Amino acid sequence: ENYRDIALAFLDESADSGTINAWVNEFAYQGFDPKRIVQLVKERGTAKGRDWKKDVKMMIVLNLVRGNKPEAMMKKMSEKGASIVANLISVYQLKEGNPGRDTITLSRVSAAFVPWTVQALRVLSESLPVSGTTMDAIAGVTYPRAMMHPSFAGIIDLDLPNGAGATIADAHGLFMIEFSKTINPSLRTKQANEVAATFEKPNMAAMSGRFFTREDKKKLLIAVGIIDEDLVLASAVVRSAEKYRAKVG
Amino acid sequence: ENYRDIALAFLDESADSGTINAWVNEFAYQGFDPKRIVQLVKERGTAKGKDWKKDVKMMIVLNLVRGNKPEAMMKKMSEKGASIVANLISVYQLKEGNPGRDTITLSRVSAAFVPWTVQALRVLSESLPVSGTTMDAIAGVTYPRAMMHPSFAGIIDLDLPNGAGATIADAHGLFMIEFSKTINPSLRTKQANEVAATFEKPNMAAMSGRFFTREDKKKLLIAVGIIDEDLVLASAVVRSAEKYRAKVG
Amino acid sequence: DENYRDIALAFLDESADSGTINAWVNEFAYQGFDPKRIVQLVKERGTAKGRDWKKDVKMMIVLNLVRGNKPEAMMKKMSEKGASIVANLISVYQLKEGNPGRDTITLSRVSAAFVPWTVQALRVLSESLPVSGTTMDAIAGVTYPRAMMHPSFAGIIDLDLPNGAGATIADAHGLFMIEFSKTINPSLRTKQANEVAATFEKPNMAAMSGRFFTREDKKKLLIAVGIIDEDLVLASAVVRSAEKYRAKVG
Amino acid sequence: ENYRDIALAFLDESADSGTINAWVNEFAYQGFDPKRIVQLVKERGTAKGRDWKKDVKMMIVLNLVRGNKPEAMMKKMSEKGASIVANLISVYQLKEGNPGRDTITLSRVSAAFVPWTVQALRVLSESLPVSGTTMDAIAGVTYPRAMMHPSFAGIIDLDLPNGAGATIADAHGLFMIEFSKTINPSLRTKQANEVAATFEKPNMAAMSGRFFTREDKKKLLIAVGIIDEDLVLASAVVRSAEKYRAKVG
Amino acid sequence: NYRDIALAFLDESADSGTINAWVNEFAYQGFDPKRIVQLVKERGTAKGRDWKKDVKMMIVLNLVRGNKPEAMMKKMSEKGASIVANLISVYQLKEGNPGRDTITLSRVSAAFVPWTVQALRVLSESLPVSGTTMDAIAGVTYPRAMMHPSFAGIIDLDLPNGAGATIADAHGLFMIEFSKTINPSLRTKQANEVAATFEKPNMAAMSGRFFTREDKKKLLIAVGIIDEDLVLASAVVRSAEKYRAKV
Amino acid sequence: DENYRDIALAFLDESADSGTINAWVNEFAYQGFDPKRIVQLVKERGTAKGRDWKKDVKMMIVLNLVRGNKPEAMMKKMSEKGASIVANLISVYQLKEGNPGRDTITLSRVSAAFVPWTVQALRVLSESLPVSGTTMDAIAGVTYPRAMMHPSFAGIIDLDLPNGAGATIADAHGLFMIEFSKTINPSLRTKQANEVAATFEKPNMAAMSGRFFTREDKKKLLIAVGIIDEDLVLASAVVRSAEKYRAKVG
RNA sequence: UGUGUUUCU
RNA sequence: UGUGUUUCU
RNA sequence: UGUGUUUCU
């Protein structure tokens, strides 16, 4: 009878904006942060006197065609290329996976510098783990090259009008199942929705990231041809999207 | 033919629908008792010489921005914040998921102390998994910040005149479908009505809660702008409600 | 000695005493689940505590129909008013959580032994059951007989009813049993119908072939609850539910 | 080579159907030898100073009412009965299922000593998994109690004049389909012909058994009322037979 | 430098005699029908047996009971078990995991396949997979000669017009059924998954060199798989397309 | 500190010359092994143990031609004499199997690095190969060039020969490669010829695109082994095998 | 949701 | 490719 | 046949 009144008294209990926001800052998620990624890449690069921006491009291209394990890939590479990778590992302190807060990986570089990643994909389509022609056969259309990497999720605005964001996410999901199957063979026998379950949680975290503003994402999506000035989706996107919904439904 | 004739006689023994339904309601599943929650919080808090009212606020904010998994959220948190979460776990014996009624979770604190939860939402709406700006885009209007958590269902009086309670419930459902879609991304490809069915049962239990009286709920709904002293729904609420009904059917 | 054919043949003239044989049968017979023992123990333990034990049976059955078979567990997810009642029921009847022995009482056992009342409560509780009546109504093409919506119904099935009526009733009950088995055991939800059926048909057969109720007892029960009429004609809902079951499992 | 020539010349080597079929019959699968069973029972029984003939009777009755799983049936039995079953397992080395021919099971005892089994059935027909009253309802008449066990097949002479053996076999099948349906409830929803196929093979092997001669079988069938001294079938047998054929096709 | 070293191997000696001696040292050594027949003949004559008759009995034994003689005696009439006991004794039959000098029933059936392939015409209904079962799986009456793994030993994959490939396909139709019956864990698996369990030792059998190509041609004709003009029997080509469709 | 968001967005309008990027792709491209490194390690490890390493190369090649690329496994089915020397070769050359790093020696890589000898050994032991020369003679309409009867032959193919003669030689080699792939991997036997060709397209291309040997080196090799004459004219059997291949594949 | 997984040549 | 796997009655 | 199994909210 008084436990009810205790709870009810919290109506008049102080909800100080300042103290609440300080708690939020203490409790907030701390780990993956594109801000931290670019900061560390820039710092470590300039400390060794590198053209660090050029190193980013090379690290992204390296990531797009070889994956996320630099030490391993050197053992299966020409000496000319391996020597370059050896340096990239040295200055940027590249790890093979299981990243911590201050850890830099090739995936993280591709994700943080996605506005360039999304441009390189237009050129590398046939050298990717899943080729563009393979995706072109899976979709009924020429699949948008910009989407052919997990990092694309970072520029998706889910709140675009008329469910455009959802449709873009669907179309990207079509690539993600194929990508997930190629780098994890144990998923190749699994159903579409089972494969989707393996990526949709970190994928959602990427799409709901706040590194880029909504206007940043809109500009990126337009610049790379997913959507136009009038926010109209390209047909390849909507047709790839319905393929995805059919597979998982 | 003695013990057999006894059991056989139960055919003519009474099965009154009203008497049976009374038992069903007694024996019905109950996730937790809010009354027991505020009791245990106050008891365990004072026993350690803590400003337990302040700890309630912190646990609520922690719940709003990080969810209901205390041990897991510390693995991705600033050292400062994780330190105080560790304390809260210690003194309040915080567990995760859906344990017994004598067990405290962050989710249950926000539900039991909802008259404060509902005020904190007015402050940190942009730090939620689903932001206030997102809800503003989904509804045609500014979505009432107080509704932006499952614990809001606890202050809903379904027996308000003219089905105003059902309207408020629908307006809250507009948020709940979006919230469910991000914390459980597998639901993103499901129809709105299918998503609504995933939280129908616990949401109903919260609205049907008798911890707060109808007058208590009425006062809460007025104090937070859902309804006025004349029991008239805010325009944004009726808007969000009809958006919801059109999504669901 | 070593002519073994003649040894076996001589057992023709060997004594087959009815008295001694029946005594062996009594020693060797199955001993475990016994509705007679259940009702006896419920009645004894109830009157020893001065309870309206018949009313306790109804409450224990309703408790079983809506919450399942684990009383200690369900108290942790129940109002204090209800939990206090359950606490008493556990105390006087010595309710266990499962793995019953010969002298063990469980909620399932109460529902099974006192099935002539269980079968009446189901008419009223249909929407509060783990599998609702409306859910079964959608699975069958018809309004599924509420009386069958519990495993204990198998105890009143007479498999020897003329014209395979008993088999048809068992089929219709099997339609509910797959749904019930899937809800209380999630690991079966991905399995095929006949796989799920394999999980229950052995104890289910033991229930149908039980001898607690006579054939005339079962006939009366089945009529009283609407499965079959005075002329032993099956209700259409039963035969249509039955063919759904045969289709799933075949 | 010359070894190649040797293998090549096997092409010219014969393959007489009669000679080959003789080998098939020799090498054919044999579940157990009844002869070996009565031997081991008498040997192991006398070696422990037991009334082994009496133990045979108990094992048969035990087999008729409890089946073929000695260790399992003791878990649901009176303390008195389980005590003597434990003994029987000890002295006769009882196993379950289908082990080697040098292994005793309760099922094999009832089969080997069928001239007694067939008499016990006349006494305990209401304590069987399928009762005599049940069979009375399935047939239009009183079903011959002697047929109410799979071991009855051991005394069937298939080479009786006018296909009387086949008629007796069909009458026995009327019980066998019901017996199979209760001990293996998964078969309850199967067609009668499908159920009959589940026991066709071992039942045939029992009827084709040559442990007993035709004269031995004839004497057994007469002594138990299946047929008279003039080799005329009992009316209930021909009845049960035509009931069976109509069920099966 | 290193390039010139490699390039100099052009003028390095490739002596025919020494190379062939290395080949002989390095060559596969294990399963060899020559060794099988040699050992069967030697061990048989050392005990004064009609060893050729023993081969037939061992093959028939293999076709209807499988590859585990000690085990099958425990489920056999005393008359038959006594015979098997002798066969085990003189030929030193093992239960599996054969070494170089090991004789198994499978090995007898494989080495003496020109007789094995004749016995199958007679035993079709006593096989683990019956002829009528294979007749229902194929749309036609499946060639009895193919209803055993040992048939692969007489397949000439180099027969003109892909006839050899077609014969191998038709045999593959039986092999999936046979593999499923003796290994229950494969019964839930897809056709190509089951095929993967046998196609490696199966290929070793087809590419064996015990029989010449003309030996195989003669065998395949004698047993009706193909005719004098090397035309395939329709049952073979129809069984083959069933197999290709499954996998 | 700094904007960071702007630094990232800046990369949208950051350069992306196709030629500069493609140069990086070729540097960073996957490389199975370096033939140069292989002959180095063979000579170094061989001399360090006082061995006729040139002779060991020959034995390892012959071993590779008749037994494949799994040294530990092949010893389990080999004469005691042969297995004894294989054990040595594994020891001094540190032989591994499959596709390990570029600093690792395999039998397959020895045959590839020392292909000017491999190509001569094939002329001698063609009937001891997994696919025999007589088999290839039946598949082609003519006597199939023995020098092509191994994947390592691709290492001496000059694709930039005039009149697409390089492509013709590659196709003629492909006639063998489909058959070789079908026997070492019997699962491919039921696949279409074009599907089989796709299984070895990538490593075969890498071998032909190898720059370990110069065009003049390849030309001299191809002439010395009869694929082409001093006037760069294809042998008739090669053009035959090539058109057989194209008709199989499409 | 917490941004992971990085196969084969 | 390396010639294996041998179920249930 | 041996009368078991009792999920998630």
Tokens representing C131 are 């599998």
**Residue numbers in E near F58 (CB within 8 A):** 12, 14, 19, 22
A145: closest CA of chain F, how far (Å): 15
Contact F101, A75 (CB under 8 A): yes
Which residues lie across from A104 on neighbouring strands? A94
Contact D131, D74 (CB under 8 A): no
Resolution of this deposited model, Å: 2.6
Chain A window 73-102: residues with CB closer than 7 Å to nucleic chain G are 76, 97-99
Burial of A161 (0-12, 13-18, 19+ CB in 10 A): exposed
From residue C236, alpha-carbon distances to C151, C155, C170, C242, C245 in Å are: 21, 21, 14, 10, 14
Q: For D157, how many CA atoms within 13 A lie in the half-sphere containing its CB?
A: 20
Can you tell me the distance from the alpha carbon of D185 to that of D187, in angstroms, rounded to the nearest whole number?
5
Per-residue exposure over F80-98, b if at least 16 CB sit within 10 Å of its own CB, e if not? eebbebbeebbebbebbbe
Phi, psi of B210 (to 5 degrees): -115, 15
Tokens representing A220 are 């990126």
Q: Between chains, do B29 and C81 touch, taking CB under 8 Å as contact?
A: no
Tokens representing A28 are 């907030």
A198 is an annotated ligand-binding site residue: yes
Q: Out of C36, C43, C128, whose CB is closest to B24?
A: C128
Chain F window 112-141: residues with CB closer than 7 Å to nucleic chain G are none
- What's at B147, amino acid-wise? M
From residue D202, alpha-carbon distances to A184, D171, E84 in Å are: 50, 17, 24
From the CA of B181 to the C1' of I8: give the distance in Å. 19
Show the CA angle centred on residue C129, arms to residues C125 and C134, nearest 5°: 85
Q: What is the largest CA-CA distance in chain C?
A: 77
Residue D199 CB coordination number (10 Å): 19
From residue E198, alpha-carbon distances to B166, E29, E117 in Å are: 65, 20, 20
Outline where A31-78 has alpha helix (H). 34-47, 52-66, 70-74
Burial of B96 (0-12, 13-18, 19+ CB in 10 A): middle
SS (H, E, C) E3-66: HHHHHHHHCCCCCHHHHHHHHHHHCCCCCCHHHHHHHHHHHHHHCCCCHHHHHHHHHHHHHHHC
Can you tell me the distance from the alpha carbon of C152 to that of C204, in angstroms, rounded to the nearest whole number?
9
B41: closest CA of chain C, how far (Å): 18
Can you tell me the distance from the alpha carbon of D216 to that of D156, in angstroms, rounded to the nearest whole number?
10
Per-residue exposure over D107-121, b if at least 16 CB sit within 10 Å of its own CB, e if not? bbbbbbbbbbbbbbb
First and final C-alpha spacing in chain B: 57
Protein residue at shortest CA distance from C1' of H2: E204
Q: Residue B47 CA to chain centroid, in angstroms?
A: 28
From the CA of C68 to the C1' of G1: give the distance in Å. 34
Return the residue matching tokens 């350069």: F15
Measuring CA to CA, which residue among F118, F146, F64 is closest to residue E7? F118
Measuring CA to CA, which residue among E221, E209, E225, E240 is closest to residue E138? E240
Can you tell me the distance from the alpha carbon of D45 to that of D90, in angstroms, rounded to the nearest whole number?
10
Measuring CA to CA, which residue among D91, D45, D89 is closest to residue D70? D89
DSSP string, chain E: -HHHHHHGGGSS---HHHHHHHHHHHS--S--HHHHHHHHHHHHHHTT--HHHHHHHHHHHHHHH-S-HHHHHTTB-HHHHHHHHHHHHHHTB-SS---TT-B-HHHHHHHTHHHHHHHHHHHGGGSSS-HHHHHHHSSS---GGGSSGGGGGG--TT-GGGHHHHHHHHHHHHHHHHHHHH-GGGTTS-HHHHHHHHHHHHHHHHT--SS-HHHHHHHHHHTTSB-TT-PBPHHHHHHHHHHHHH-
Q: Between chains, do A159 and B138 touch, taking CB under 8 Å as contact?
A: yes
Sign of torsion over alpha carbons A226, A231, A234, A240? positive
Residues 6+ apart with CB under 8 A from B73: A27, B62, B66, B67, B85
Q: Which of F7, F26, F40, F103 is the best residue to mutate to test the A interface, defined by the most A CB atoms within 10 Å of its own CB?
A: F7
Helix (H/G/I), strand (E/B), else coil: A227: strand
Phi, psi of A191 (to 5 degrees): -75, 160
Rounded to 10 degrees, the C-alpha dihedral D186/D187/D190/D192 comes to -170
Q: Out of D61, D122, D223, whose CB is closest to C24?
A: D61
A53: closest CA of chain B, how far (Å): 29
Residues 6+ apart with CB under 8 A from A90: none
Q: Which of C80, C84, C129, C146 is the best residue to mutate to test the B interface, defined by the most B CB atoms within 10 Å of its own CB?
A: C80
Contact C136, C237 (CB under 8 A): no
State the nucleotide closest to E27 in CA–C1' terms. H2
Burial of E55 (0-12, 13-18, 19+ CB in 10 A): buried
Measured between CA atoms, the residue of chain E closest to residue F188 is E199
Sign of torsion over alpha carbons D185, D186, D190, D193? negative
Measuring CA to CA, which residue among D153, D161, D151 is closest to residue D208? D153
Phi, psi of B130 (to 5 degrees): -105, 115
Contact A236, A142 (CB under 8 A): yes
Measured between CA atoms, the residue of chain E closest to residue D36 is E78
Measuring CA to CA, which residue among F6, F10, F25 is closest to residue A223? F10
Can you tell me the distance from the alpha carbon of F166 to that of F145, in angstroms, rounded to the nearest whole number?
15
DSSP for residue A77: B
Can you tell me the distance from the alpha carbon of E204 to that of A232, in angstroms, rounded to the nearest whole number?
60
**Residue numbers in E near F186 (CB within 8 A):** 199-200, 202-203
Chains E and B touch (3+ CB pairs under 8 A): no
Can you tell me the distance from the alpha carbon of B40 to that of A19, in angstroms, rounded to the nearest whole number?
25
Helix (H/G/I), strand (E/B), else coil: F101: coil
From residue A210, alpha-carbon distances to A153, A156, B139, B176, B188 in Å are: 12, 11, 21, 21, 20
Q: Out of B11, B21, B101, whose CB is closest to C116?
A: B11
Can you tell me the distance from the alpha carbon of A218 to that of A236, in angstroms, rounded to the nearest whole number?
18
Residue numbering of the annotated binding site of C for RNA: 30, 33, 66, 70, 108-109, 189, 199, 202, 209
Can you tell me the distance from the alpha carbon of C177 to that of C148, in angstroms, rounded to the nearest whole number?
9
Measuring CA to CA, which residue among A124, A119, A145 is closest to residue A234? A145
Sign of torsion over alpha carbons C51, C57, C58, C59? positive
The length of chain A is 249
From residue C127, alpha-carbon distances to C131, C146, C226, D10, F49 in Å are: 8, 10, 19, 76, 85
Q: Which of D88, D127, D222 is the best residue to mutate to test the C interface, defined by the most C CB atoms within 10 Å of its own CB?
A: D127
From the CA of B67 to the C1' of I6: give the distance in Å. 30
Can you tell me the distance from the alpha carbon of D67 to that of D97, in angstroms, rounded to the nearest whole number?
10
DSSP string, D92-107: HT---SS--TT---HH
Can you tell me the distance from the alpha carbon of C46 to that of C38, in angstroms, rounded to the nearest whole number?
12
Residue C149 CB coordination number (10 Å): 26
C32: closest CA of chain D, how far (Å): 6
Q: For C45, how many CA atoms within 13 A lie in the half-sphere containing its CB?
A: 19
**Residue numbers in C near D127 (CB within 8 A):** 25, 29
Contact F122, F146 (CB under 8 A): yes
Q: Residue D19 CA to chain centroid, in angstroms?
A: 30
Q: Which of A35, A89, A220 is the best residue to mutate to test the F interface, defined by the most F CB atoms within 10 Å of its own CB?
A: A35
Sign of torsion over alpha carbons C16, C22, C27, C31? positive
Chains C and B touch (3+ CB pairs under 8 A): yes
A29: closest CA of chain B, how far (Å): 5
Contact E98, E107 (CB under 8 A): yes
Q: Out of C4, C21, C171, whose CB is closest to D61?
A: C21
Q: Between chains, do A57 and F2 touch, taking CB under 8 Å as contact?
A: no
Can you tell me the distance from the alpha carbon of A63 to that of A108, in angstroms, rounded to the nearest whole number?
10
Which residues lie across from F30 on neighbouring strands? A77
Q: Between chains, do D56 and C24 touch, taking CB under 8 Å as contact?
A: no
Tokens representing F76 are 């389990």
Tokens representing A211 are 């590194």
Q: Out of C66, C74, C212, whose CB is closest to B4?
A: C212
Burial of A102 (0-12, 13-18, 19+ CB in 10 A): exposed
Neighbours of chain F (3+ CB pairs under 8 A): A, E
A232 is an annotated ligand-binding site residue: no
Residues of C with CB under 8 A from a CB of D: 4-5, 7-12, 14, 16, 18, 21-22, 24-32, 160, 162, 167, 170-171, 174, 194, 197-198, 201-202, 204-205, 209, 245-246, 249-250
Residue F216 CB coordination number (10 Å): 9
The length of chain F is 250
D208 touches strand H (CB under 7 A): no
Burial of D2 (0-12, 13-18, 19+ CB in 10 A): exposed
Angle between helices B34-46 and B52-66 (to 10 degrees): 120
Q: Between chains, do B11 and C74 touch, taking CB under 8 Å as contact?
A: no
E133 touches strand H (CB under 7 A): no
Q: Out of E25, E30, E200, whose CB is closest to F77?
A: E30
Element (H, E) at C192: none
Sign of torsion over alpha carbons D182, D184, D185, D191? negative
A35: closest CA of chain F, how far (Å): 6
Tokens representing D170 are 């069909």
Can you tell me the distance from the alpha carbon of D98 to that of D105, in angstroms, rounded to the nearest whole number?
8
Q: Between chains, do C67 and B29 touch, taking CB under 8 Å as contact?
A: yes
F101: closest CA of chain A, how far (Å): 5
- What's at F187, amino acid-wise? S
Phi, psi of F194 (to 5 degrees): -65, -35
Helix (H/G/I), strand (E/B), else coil: A189: coil
SS (H, E, C) chain B: CCHHHHHHHCCCCCCCHHHHHHHHHHHCCCCCCHHHHHHHHHHHHHCCCCCHHHHHHHHHHHHHHHCCCHHHHHHHCCHHHHHHHHHHHHHHCCCCCCCCCCCCCHHHHHHHCHHHHHHHCCCCHHHCCCCHHHHHHHCCCCCCHHHCCHHHHHHCCCCCHHHHHHHHHHHHHHHHHHHHHHHCHHHHHCCHHHHHHHHHHHHHHHHCCCCCCHHHHHHHHHHCCCECCCCCECHHHHHHHHHHHHHHC
Burial of B16 (0-12, 13-18, 19+ CB in 10 A): exposed
Chains D and C touch (3+ CB pairs under 8 A): yes
Q: Between chains, do C78 and B15 touch, taking CB under 8 Å as contact?
A: no
**Residue numbers in E near F86 (CB within 8 A):** 26
Can you tell me the distance from the alpha carbon of D35 to that of D240, in angstroms, rounded to the nearest whole number?
31
Chain E window 34-63: residues with CB closer than 7 Å to nucleic chain H are none
A108 is an annotated ligand-binding site residue: yes
From residue C228, alpha-carbon distances to B7, B88, C122, C213 in Å are: 21, 62, 17, 17
From residue D211, alpha-carbon distances to C4, D38, D53, D105, F104 in Å are: 10, 11, 19, 18, 71
Return the residue matching tokens 């009609």: E50
Burial of B222 (0-12, 13-18, 19+ CB in 10 A): middle
Question: What are all long-range contacts of C79-87, with beta carbons under 8 Å and residues at least 24 apart?
Answer: C79/B26, C79/B28, C79/B30, C79/B33, C80/B33, C81/B26, C82/B26, C82/B27, C82/B28, C85/B26, C85/C59, C86/B27
Helix (H/G/I), strand (E/B), else coil: F79: coil
